[PDB]
Design an enzyme around this catalytic site. Structure first.
Site, PDB file in Angstrom:
ATOM      1  N   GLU A   1      31.780 -18.893   3.911  1.00 31.08           N
ATOM      2  CA  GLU A   1      31.872 -18.881   2.952  1.00 31.08           C
ATOM      3  C   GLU A   1      31.780 -19.689   2.199  1.00 31.08           C
ATOM      4  O   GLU A   1      31.410 -20.535   2.331  1.00 31.08           O
ATOM      5  CB  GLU A   1      33.783 -18.173   1.818  1.00 31.08           C
ATOM      6  CG  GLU A   1      34.075 -19.399   1.920  1.00 31.08           C
ATOM      7  CD  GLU A   1      35.873 -19.049   1.758  1.00 31.08           C
ATOM      8  OE1 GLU A   1      35.577 -17.948   1.090  1.00 31.08           O
ATOM      9  OE2 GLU A   1      37.336 -19.921   1.746  1.00 31.08           O
TER      10      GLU A   1
ATOM     11  N   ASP B   1      36.896 -25.836  -5.761  1.00 27.24           N
ATOM     12  CA  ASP B   1      35.558 -25.100  -5.655  1.00 27.24           C
ATOM     13  C   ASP B   1      34.526 -26.093  -6.132  1.00 27.24           C
ATOM     14  O   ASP B   1      34.051 -25.685  -6.878  1.00 27.24           O
ATOM     15  CB  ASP B   1      35.659 -24.157  -5.830  1.00 27.24           C
ATOM     16  CG  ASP B   1      36.805 -22.597  -5.035  1.00 27.24           C
ATOM     17  OD1 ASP B   1      36.743 -22.950  -4.017  1.00 27.24           O
ATOM     18  OD2 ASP B   1      37.491 -22.120  -5.968  1.00 27.24           O
TER      19      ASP B   1
END
Lengths: 537, 537, 538
Positions: free
Chosen positions: C186, C14
């Site tokens: 997302e 991420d």
């Protein structure tokens, strides 16, 4: 009219297409359904009709006890030396380290028979296919199974000469091809084209990862060079393509030298709104099973190419041949006023016989004698026909006088011995004759109408049942008069009667709708069915 | 000498005892093992020998494809009117909401046959038993199966008169008894004693909860009064009793009026030290399956009582009869010198035939022809004999010339098609002929010698295999000279070849040790076995 | 030298990349590992070094009891108004119909702190990201969670203004974008480029189906037009691409106007020979977890394009910037001579403290006090560092005097509380001090040396443990003199300590190698570790 895919709707997998003169035939796999190997006919590739099932007796095909999605796997139909040659496979084990099976050869001068007494060939793998070399020799190719648990089971494609004189394979298996990285290398077919040998195989497995690839060699023994742009055929990368699972192909050349590719495909129901499009394996359910499509082929630099792209198209340019339409092979309402059960009905595993039922005991009715349950892999008095649209109504009426909960008769929606639903006339201690509902869901059995069973008045001889299939949902209804129907207050999932939902090693058929009679007591109670209706919306 | 239980060791369940004059016989269930129905004989209840298997051809018993632990369920053997009467049951479905089966009658004037062509009686439930009323009438009792998913399946005991005139059951099932709270009411047997009717049943299921209860009625149709102190027989409350799972009984009276009770029992292997004694269902494993024991009965106030207590005892006072020992029915080393396979060997599902092997093709050897895998419910070239002790050595030697990993032959320890182990001669691409090991554990297949397979020298024609079973553990060994053995360094779990371990609905047999030949290719490669050794320690 | 992906190796998912002047930073998610939020620095995008973890105390991050692969999910690091802004998310529920979590903001003038008292923003979904609008207004975007069981849970992207003055979100959530068909929408990030708003999102889930797509709108509120050629980034169609699972990206512009795209990726171990190549979900296991790569971006018609193709490449043209290699942040052998624990070690859930161990109680050793088991989500005396190569040797030595099987200390290879292996010094009734081995495999615990435990001579004060990781296999060894090592005859599966193998809803970390002490009795029995080695083949 152009080709509109799929050309063979509902459960019709593993197409083996052949041209004999001006006639085209496609053989498809039938698994546990009897009689074995469906054969459809066409003269234009556009219009098809169901014409034969060669495996019509227990001397061809003895499937009592066979596992669900065992029995007849991919068939191979060819034409040479004035006859048809059919290679078929009875698979006995469909999950675990082995895939025990037996490949047979039978031949016929006419597609409708008689077919010759089977010759047992081998069992080294399934997908056996016979190749008629220009030399006059015959060769079998099949996949070769490696049971060893640390290996992939698909060890490649074996070749052996078949001696017509000796009625047996000679020499020993030769592995001529190992496949590509996509693996699951199966469905081998050989072709002699451009004075070379082409070996075409299915790969990736018959799921959304399915594909077909071709390779070529100057000699039959190889090595084979794989086409540069492999795969020839696959919808794996195109999650919205109308045709999915595209593979297990066979190639045909027309009388004018045009090329076409028959293959299997699945058409999933729409997933619920908003669900992830790449998750076909979780949300894309095919109740019509694997169907047969035809693509058009063009050649470039000695390699075939699927017109319109590798994913496969719905609308395909018809060959330059006079078109010929066919009479329907069934009527929307089958009144059972003929002595021959319609060709669109099959039984499970065993022949239709007087033990299971009769069209002559009570002319104008199909009389079924109650036999073993829906779970049984032996003797079910159960006839059924394929779902061939996502939207249809089907129905029947039955006269049945059960005296115990051990007996039931009615309408079925059926995938395998542990995946089905049944609305039926049965008996209860306090209500007498009743309409009830049972469902089987990967071996979990449910009775959703428990305590709300519908009493059938003594004066009601005939109970009508109806199923209305509407995409993802179906519902059952009943009538005491043939005019007003009452829907049972349950929405059943069509998507559970699908290749993609059922558990176990074998997931190779498709949804059927049928009629059955069960009598566990042993008294063979008769159930008399006046009609069977099937109407696509 | 006293009775020392179990009198029939290893897999020998559901005993049906009968006296015919001075002779006693016990029939036990054989499930998928062929020939069907074991019959042992005795003259004193102490000494027993295996003498017959009536269901010896496919006309009697056709089990290809049957599920594991389907086939022959509890048999009923009686004697009247100058003949034996055998009721037997072929069960086709062993899990889920139904238990599809068929009950048959066959008769004989000699236990060894010939037996009469079977008469199909019914399918309303299993555990059918024939009662010979002193009137001359005959009656069938069976359990009655209720499939309905919200009910217990064991609806009680059904009665019908059997017409010897018409070879059919008369009228319709009548439920004469519902059982006790312990339920799973099965194994019904009727007796006429004290000028009234006794109905004895198994209850609780054939697990550690098993029991037997008796009930009595002035008339055959009841109602039956349940004995006050029920159950008659059960070891459920005694976790350390040497005999467990005590139920499924039959009651015999001797020539001079003494009463005895045959019943099934399991003898678990000791659990690991310190494990909780009430956790039999977790830790108590019976590789010898369900065996047959005999208890002594005394009568008090018109009710039978088990001498020594309801749990069942190991040592039981022998009847007051002259004692008579029998010659063994096998030799510790079977050199395959006789023309008939030993009566202690069975095949799976189908008859031994030249298709499977031959004692004549190579005199002094059993030649097996390689057929289907250990997973197959169809055609295995595999013969085997029961484990009948917790400690034993068994072995063979084999000559086999495999050319592919598709062929293997050797020694087996086998429970069902997904629970077994196999040490065998096979072939590898790099090493040529090798010894390898495969195991199946509730459908998980493993190859623990992978990469460490034993090369067999070209000069070694005969490979000897041995298994050493020592309670909870067993090990395989091999030898290239028949004298010096090398143990493979793996301890295999005996406890996994047991009723208590295997998954699925059918858990009704026991461990066997055997020899087999597999040839997936289809070439029927021969494996020549010089001997089969079984030595209890 | 060009960029050689992954630039951040081993568990480093991420990535949120930011440029502050000439400095580049990437924040990566840390889940249950403490301290939270790894930050790496670079001045050229080629050479990176680990420099900070801002969430360094329980005032920032309180994870005792958190689920495996709960805790710190994707972070967002930005720079504006003379400070760094860090949005972080503590996830409390990682499976089922809800995904309970809380998003926080902390700020700092320097990457190493001090960081400001966290401000609780919201919990409407994870992947919160702060956007600095050219107006001076600030906005938060996050995914919005829909728990309803007949819906896909990823309802789209919510936008709210953040008030700096009031330290809260104002107004109410507005759903500005629903994603594409690929869904699992997302990782939202907004960018002001071409005088308009670009909303970039991860889609398809962080598996082999992962991807990134961008969309653009005149106003922040949308509607957003999706790029025609979507996705921007995905290796889904290329089963042999060295980089897999390509998604969860962030975009950066260099001081010279070049564009680069940080994203996560997994690099599976090779599958066994002959296995089907499309079956990544069955056979492709990533013990290094999700790593960070950087792609180069070019612009065409106002849309970004990944140079070399959407699948992502291993070698990427370096930016036109002077290069600076960094000193290593650890040494191959750590002799535990320093009084603070190396930055490459983390603890589970809770801070390293005197309760767990000490570098001063016995100078020259790390003393760990025996605490709770390897199964505990509470208080493990266990320090570990990431696997960052497929081929490495690691090791330690320990002094430990257990008096019960209730105590054990040694070397670990660890994924989560039910997926690990441990070689350790413990005690047996008959053999005394022994070396033993325990494994955990999706909650099935095994003891392969049972009955064959290695007795430790009373003379032996120090036991040495080593692990040798070689692709799909790893093996343990021990020594009683530090010179002659004996290898236990078991080949353990590296592929089982991977995102792809572990069960449950949270599969978001990667394999670690560590050292631990357990004392179930309660006596805090000390284990003295002299050193910790880690050496890669690279």
């Amino acid at each position: 009219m152009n080709i509109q895919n799929p050309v063979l709707k509902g459960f019709n997998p593993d197409p083996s297409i052949v041209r004999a003169g001006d006639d085209y035939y496609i053989a498809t796999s039938t698994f546990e359904w009897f009689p074995g190997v469906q054969i459809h006919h066409s003269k234009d590739l556009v219009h098809w009709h169901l014409v034969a099932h060669p495996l019509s007796t227990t001397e061809f095909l003895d499937m009592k006890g066979n596992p669900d999605s065992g029995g007849i796997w991919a068939p191979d139909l060819s034409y040479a030396d004035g006859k048809f040659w059919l290679i078929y496979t009875d698979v006995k084990v469909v999950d675990g380290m082995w895939k025990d099976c037996h490949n047979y050869l039978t031949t016929a001068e006419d597609i409708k028979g008689p077919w010759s007494k089977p010759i047992l060939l081998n069992g080294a793998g399934f997908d056996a296919s016979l190749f008629h070399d220009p030399s006059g020799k015959k060769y079998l190719v099949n996949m070769y199974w490696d049971q060893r648990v640390y290996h992939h089971n698909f060890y490649g494609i074996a070749l052996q000469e078949y001696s017509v004189a000796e009625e047996k394979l000679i020499g020993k298996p030769e592995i001529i091809y190992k496949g590509t990285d996509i693996a699951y290398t199966e469905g081998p077919h050989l072709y002699y084209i451009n004075d070379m040998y082409y070996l075409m195989t299915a790969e990736g497995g018959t799921t959304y990862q399915h594909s077909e690839t071709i390779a070529r060699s100057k000699t039959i023994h190889g090595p084979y060079e794989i086409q540069p742009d492999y795969p020839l055929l696959s919808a794996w990368k195109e999650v919205h393509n109308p045709l999915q699972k595209c593979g297990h192909a066979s190639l045909v050349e027309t009388q004018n030298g045009q090329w076409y590719l028959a293959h299997l495909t699945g058409r999933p129901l729409p997933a619920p709104a908003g669900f992830p499009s790449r998750e076909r394996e979780q949300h894309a359910f095919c109740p019509l099973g694997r169907e047969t499509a035809i693509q058009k082929i063009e050649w470039q630099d000695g390699w075939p190419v699927v017109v319109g792209g590798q994913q496969g198209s719905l609308e395909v340019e018809a060959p330059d041949l006079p078109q010929q339409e066919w009479a329907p092979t069934y009527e929307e309402r089958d009144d059972f006023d003929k002595d021959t059960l319609n060709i669109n009905f099959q039984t499970l595993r065993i022949p239709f016989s007087e033990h299971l039922g009769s069209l002559t005991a009570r002319p104008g009715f199909l009389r079924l004698y109650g036999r073993e349950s829906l779970q049984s892999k032996f003797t079910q008095a159960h006839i059924a026909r394929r779902w061939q649209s996502f939207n249809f109504d089907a129905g029947t009426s039955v006269e049945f006088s059960p005296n115990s909960f051990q007996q039931m008769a009615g309408l079925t929606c059926y995938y395998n011995t542990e995946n089905w639903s049944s609305i039926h006339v049965t008996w209860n201690e306090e209500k007498g004759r009743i309409i009830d509902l049972v469902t089987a869901d990967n071996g979990t059995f449910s009775m959703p109408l428990a305590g709300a069973e519908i009493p059938i008045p003594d004066e009601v001889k005939t109970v009508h049942f109806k199923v209305s299939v509407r995409g993802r949902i179906y519902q059952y209804a009943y009538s005491f008069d043939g005019e007003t129907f009452h829907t049972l207050p349950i929405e059943l999932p069509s998507w559970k009667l699908s290749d993609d939902y059922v558990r176990g090693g074998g997931f190779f058929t498709g949804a059927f709708v049928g009629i059955n009679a069960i009598d566990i007591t042993g008294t063979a109670l008769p159930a008399d069915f006046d009609y069977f209706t099937y109407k696509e919306l």
